[PDB]
Design a protein around this ligand. Sequence first.
Ligand SMILES: Nc1ncnc2c1ncn2[C@@H]1O[C@H](COP(=O)(O)OP(=O)(O)O)[C@@H](O)[C@H]1O
Ligand SMILES: CC(=O)/N=C1/NN(C(C)=O)[C@](C)(c2ccccc2)S1
Ligand SMILES: [Mg+2]
Length: 319
Amino acid sequence: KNIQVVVRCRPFNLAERKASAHSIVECDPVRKEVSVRTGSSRKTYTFDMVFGASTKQIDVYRSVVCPILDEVIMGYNCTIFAYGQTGTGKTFTMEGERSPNEEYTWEEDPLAGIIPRTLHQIFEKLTDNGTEFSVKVSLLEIYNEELFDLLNPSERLQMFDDPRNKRGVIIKGLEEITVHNKDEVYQILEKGAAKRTTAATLMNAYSSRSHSVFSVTIHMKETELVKIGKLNLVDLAGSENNINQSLLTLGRVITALVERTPHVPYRESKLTRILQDSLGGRTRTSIIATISPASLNLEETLSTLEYAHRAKNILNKPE
Ligand SMILES: Nc1ncnc2c1ncn2[C@@H]1O[C@H](COP(=O)(O)OP(=O)(O)O)[C@@H](O)[C@H]1O
Ligand SMILES: CC(=O)/N=C1/NN(C(C)=O)[C@](C)(c2ccccc2)S1
Ligand SMILES: [Mg+2]
């Protein structure tokens, strides 16, 4: 199956209003098109889905992620990437935010993004639909070609080949935490958030240059036939950017794949080793390309759109 590629455009922000920018992006969800005025000259792209600035978190989840979670629960591996310019909505999309003033429970918060909703829906979907299951999660960051375990309450992780799968790696020392119930989900996410703000203190431009890999693995057993599904939820460093080796190598890998070049340089960065199987392997993969509507960003926005559109022709073969 081909990589699914969707675009999410966010509303104008006030920094763009202060820069005197005008709108140059038109999202057409019905036609699945994004049009960019390139000076009345225009460039249109077609994607698998297009989400405009009024799209709600829950819309993204139902339209993009629900199909993918169903595949995981069938026992496949899946990956969703968020790709795009700093400030355009990668983290808002993958993680979301809490609404102000303690107004919602985490499970009901309309600003939750893909990660919290996915973990909540795992428990809704598998609970007492006949199923015995366990769920574990891990969260690592990649910064400056170094691995950081956001769930380790203490360091630096070591990468080993997976002798069982050539397109795979094993991260020794990664905290893979069992999530026993919905209430545990929020405690674990809270714990990763605290670990990331202190990650913020000891880093240079850390969040915009770091990659974040959240992984959930579901062990499922029914009578006695077993299923193991994995989902990786990846928030990439900003696309405008050892500090950039992984982002740059991701660009070479995608290029190598789109040109059918026989040498794909997967092993030239930690990110591309981790998601080697997501890029031309046996994992089903979607990319959410995030963009700004503002004229200020024409060059980054065109770069993001070209990058993402080319990705549509990469074929994966799940299982
Ligand atoms: N679709 C959207 N609607 C409203 N606010 C958004 C949207 N996307 C991003 N934002 C806000 O814009 C700011 C930057 O988004 P963020 O997701 O942190 O960007 P990135 O991770 O790409 O740098 C944040 O305050 C975020 O809440
Ligand atoms: C890796 C990741 O996604 N981490 C998260 N931490 N959150 C905390 C601590 O509120 C997020 C923002 C959230 C938002 C709404 C509902 C529940 C969780 S998501
Ligand atoms: Mg971010």
